[PDB]
Amino acid sequence: KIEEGKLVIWINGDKGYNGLAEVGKKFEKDTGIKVTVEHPDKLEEKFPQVAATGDGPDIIFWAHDRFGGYAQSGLLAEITPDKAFQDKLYPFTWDAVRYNGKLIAYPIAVEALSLIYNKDLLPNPPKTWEEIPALDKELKAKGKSALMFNLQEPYFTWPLIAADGGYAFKYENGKYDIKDVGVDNAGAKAGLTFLVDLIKNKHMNADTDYSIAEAAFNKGETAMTINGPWAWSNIDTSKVNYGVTVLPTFKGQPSKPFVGVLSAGINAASPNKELAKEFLENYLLTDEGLEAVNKDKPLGAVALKSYEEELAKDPRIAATMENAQKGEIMPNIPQMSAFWYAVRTAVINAASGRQTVDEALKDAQTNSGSDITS
Amino acid sequence: EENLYFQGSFTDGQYLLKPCLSHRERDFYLHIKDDKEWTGTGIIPKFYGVELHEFGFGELEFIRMENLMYKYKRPFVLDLKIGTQTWDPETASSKMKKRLVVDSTSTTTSLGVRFSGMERNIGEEKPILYSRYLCTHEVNTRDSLKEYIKLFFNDGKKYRKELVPYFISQLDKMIEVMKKREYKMFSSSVLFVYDSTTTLEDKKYNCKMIDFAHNWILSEEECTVEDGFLFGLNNLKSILEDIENEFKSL
């Protein structure tokens, strides 16, 4: 029961929703079409529930991984940007919004982990993971640590695990092969082994989580952390002199973070699809549209080339895009939930010492292929 | 039922997370969690509790169970489905015809036990898997079932005849509990496992009743149809006794 002749947009409360509303007011001034931006609690849960009825927002904003499940249930309309429009956004961002061969959302922002370092403690941060043990030794003697980051969540630990050849599902032929999982190959074992040795050798603590690591870095206790652009404003409040840079290499190969793409999908039940396309292509995805949003709450890096080129004068943004391009788009397929469970479990079990790396990743291989259709 | 026991299950070190397809299995483990005849006798896997887990479509219910093959290097696995029928009062009429066929063409009707799948890890090769579908043509007599059970005890080099007494002792314990006729169990199994690297110093073998998705708690609910469970256990024991005698010449 979506009302015709208006646009209702759903976006999360930590985004620049007042900025997006200003873009909505500009749209209303030109078209006479009222745009209402809302930020309800747990909208990512509400949307699939409410959209199944055939009601809810015309446009929904969320990370692209979640939109695959939405498109599986047929809740998202196929978008129709012409060739000219597609050329305005970075090619890899379009790969992130493709599901069953069709485009199902407009890319808005690009997020990826980077190495965040304290310039005062470490003006020349390490280029390799291999030099961190020696660096920690030096820093401990001065009363600090080298590196603290969230070890509890595989999103944060995966970039090292994937570096020397680990992967989630083989991508080729425009398709993910869910029977070909790369969590238990030589590369994944090498990466996880290095991570566990860091703990064995007292350079990291197995129990370090998001909150502990963030507090420590922002208080000047540790020289480095690994985090995304969402974390920068807390560091800004802390008065630590920090930089953001390329992740360290492992065995001469780049760390490979998963790339998240904030995307705007169109409700398949919306009777305002043409209105939504005009809004998204010609109002939001312009320098002026993204600026309005960015001014309210920063987007980090963006998919729109023209505006990204302005933002990338900030080296933290340049770093984010660099790491993103060395990483991999996060797969959007249902089986990713099994993969995430698998890697989470394996890292905790290996890091705790109750399983060896080989034992833990053997179970990860099995778990990744578990038949999650209940 | 159609629902293979390990399908959708997760491994977490010494635990498995087993998805709840209905409440019957969960309710059974909760019902016996304080009963010594079940929990102190080593005849079912240890139960640790119910847990909710999100897998990208909403929270699913799982029960946390003992992983019977924890740290097994070369696993050997045999699943035998127990009972004289594998349907119950809740079985869909659309699925009834097939159950009736398979129950009679397999050894289910005649023995109350049938072959349900096997895995053998026979050195450094990929595992050899033996499908449940063998039961309706290749393992459809007492003699062939006995031969396939002997193959389970064949580690690739020798028959592990020293393990057979353990399996008989386990069946005896199951018989003693099931004599009380407090439950009806349809399509449940006895799982046989060992690690071929097992030694006297590191014992790695197990025999457990599993898969209680069609268990009826007779004190709480009526079920008039017979399961033939005790009949199945007795026939399985008889086969193991025959194997023990046949292995004496080794």
Cβ atoms of B51 and B170 closer than 8 Å: no
Does residue A2 belong to any structural domain of this protein? Answer: no
CB pair distance less than 8 Å for B54 and A337: yes
Residues flagged as binding site of B for Mg(2+): 211
* Domain boundaries, position A59: 7-111+259-329
Residues A121 and A101 in one domain: no
CB pair distance less than 8 Å for B7 and A336: no
Residues flagged as binding site of B: 18, 65-66, 68, 79, 81, 95, 98-99, 132-133, 211
With beta carbons under 8 A apart, name residues in chain A contacting B7.
Answer: 371
CB pair distance less than 8 Å for B8 and A371: yes
Instruction: For residues A218 and A149, give the distance between their C-alpha atoms in angstroms, rounded to a whole number.
Output: 12
CB pair distance less than 8 Å for A372 and B11: no
Cβ atoms of A360 and A350 closer than 8 Å: yes
Which residues of B fall below an 8 Å CB-CB distance to A?
7-13, 19, 21, 53-57, 60, 71
The secondary structure of A197-260, three-state, reads HHHHCCCCCCCCCHHHHHHHHHCCCEEEEEECHHHHHHHHHHCCCEEEECCCEECCECCCCEEE
CB pair distance less than 8 Å for A363 and B57: no
Does residue A1 belong to any structural domain of this protein? Answer: no
Instruction: For residues A151 and A160, give the distance between their C-alpha atoms in angstroms, rounded to a whole number.
Output: 12
Q: Does A334 touch chain B (CB under 8 A)?
A: yes
Residues A135 and A168 in one domain: yes
Phi, then psi, of A322 in degrees rounded to 5: -60, -50
User: Facing residues of B64 across strands?
Assistant: B17, B49
Distances (CA, A) of B223 to A31, A33, B178, B220: 68, 64, 16, 10
Residue B65: which of B87, B50, B79, B54 has the closest Cα?
B50
For residue A241, how far is the Cα from the chain centroid?
A: 25
What torsion do the CA atoms of A42, A48, A51, A53 make, to the nearest 10 degrees? -110
With beta carbons under 8 A apart, name residues in chain B contacting A374.
Answer: 8, 19, 21, 55, 60
Phi, then psi, of B154 in degrees rounded to 5: -90, 110
Residue A298: which of A275, A270, A325, A317 has the closest Cα?
A317
Cβ atoms of A344 and A364 closer than 8 Å: no
Question: Alpha helix locations (H) across B33-134?
Answer: 36-39, 96-105, 108-111
Tokens describing residue B135: 């039961």
Instruction: For residues B231 and A71, give the distance between their C-alpha atoms in angstroms, rounded to a whole number.
Output: 51
The beta-carbon neighbor of B19 closest among A354, A359, A374 is: A374
Cβ atoms of B31 and B215 closer than 8 Å: no
Residue B8 distance to chain A (closest CA, Å): 5
Residue A208 distance to chain B (closest CA, Å): 21
Does residue A373 belong to any structural domain of this protein? Answer: no
Instruction: For residues B246 and B229, give the distance between their C-alpha atoms in angstroms, rounded to a whole number.
Output: 26
Instruction: For residues A26 and A28, give the distance between their C-alpha atoms in angstroms, rounded to a whole number.
Output: 5
The count of domains in chain B is 1
Cβ atoms of A48 and A247 closer than 8 Å: no
Resolution (A): 1.8
Contacts of A65 (CB under 8 A, 6+ apart): A260, A330, A331, A332, A336
Query: Could you count the other beta carbons within 10 Å of the beta carbon of residue A249?
Result: 17
Residues A252 and A267 in one domain: no
CATH number at residue A139: 3.40.190.10
Contacts of A340 (CB under 8 A, 6+ apart): A154
Instruction: For residues A243 and A221, give the distance between their C-alpha atoms in angstroms, rounded to a whole number.
Output: 15
Instruction: For residues A307 and A291, give the distance between their C-alpha atoms in angstroms, rounded to a whole number.
Output: 8
Residues A74 and A126 in one domain: no
The beta-carbon neighbor of B7 closest among A338, A345, A371 is: A371
Residue B57: which of A374, A230, A59 has the closest Cα?
A374
Determined by which method?
Answer: X-ray
Does residue A374 belong to any structural domain of this protein? Answer: no
CB pair distance less than 8 Å for A69 and B57: yes
Taking CA A28 as the corner, what is the angle to CA A25 and CA A31, rounded to the nearest 5 degrees? Answer: 155
Question: Alpha helix locations (H) across chain B?
Answer: 24-32, 36-39, 96-105, 108-111, 142-152, 164-178, 229-247
- How long a stretch of residues is chain A? 374
Tokens describing residue A85: 């429009």
CATH number at residue B239: 3.30.470.160
Q: Does A186 touch chain B (CB under 8 A)?
A: no
Tokens describing residue A215: 């507090």
Tokens describing residue A234: 């807390």
The beta-carbon neighbor of A337 closest among B7, B11, B56 is: B56
Instruction: For residues A49 and B40, give the distance between their C-alpha atoms in angstroms, rounded to a whole number.
Output: 45
Residues A226 and A291 in one domain: no
Does residue A88 belong to any structural domain of this protein? Answer: yes
The count of domains in chain A is 2
Instruction: Find the closest chain A residue to B22 by CA distance.
Output: A374
Side-chain half-sphere exposure of B14, counting CA atoms within 13 A: 5
Instruction: For residues A101 and B141, give the distance between their C-alpha atoms in angstroms, rounded to a whole number.
Output: 51
Question: Alpha helix locations (H) across A267-314?
Answer: 273-279, 287-296, 305-311
User: Facing residues of B129 across strands?
Assistant: B119
Instruction: For residues A23 and B233, give the distance between their C-alpha atoms in angstroms, rounded to a whole number.
Output: 73
Find tokens 């069946």 and name the residue: B171
Instruction: For residues B100 and B105, give the distance between their C-alpha atoms in angstroms, rounded to a whole number.
Output: 9
For residue B78, how far is the Cα from the chain centroid?
A: 8
Instruction: For residues B76 and B206, give the distance between their C-alpha atoms in angstroms, rounded to a whole number.
Output: 10
With beta carbons under 8 A apart, name residues in chain A contacting B10.
Answer: 341, 345, 367, 370
Q: Does A356 touch chain B (CB under 8 A)?
A: no
CB pair distance less than 8 Å for B8 and A374: yes
Query: Could you count the other beta carbons within 10 Å of the beta carbon of residue A50?
Result: 18
CB pair distance less than 8 Å for B60 and A69: no
Residues 87-126 of A with CB under 8 A from B: none
**Helix and strand counts by DSSP (H, E) for chain B:** 7, 11
Residues A228 and A352 in one domain: yes
Taking CA B167 as the corner, what is the angle to CA B161 and CA B173, rounded to the nearest 5 degrees? Answer: 155
Does residue A250 belong to any structural domain of this protein? Answer: yes
* Domain boundaries, position B171: 1-250
Tokens describing residue B31: 């019902």
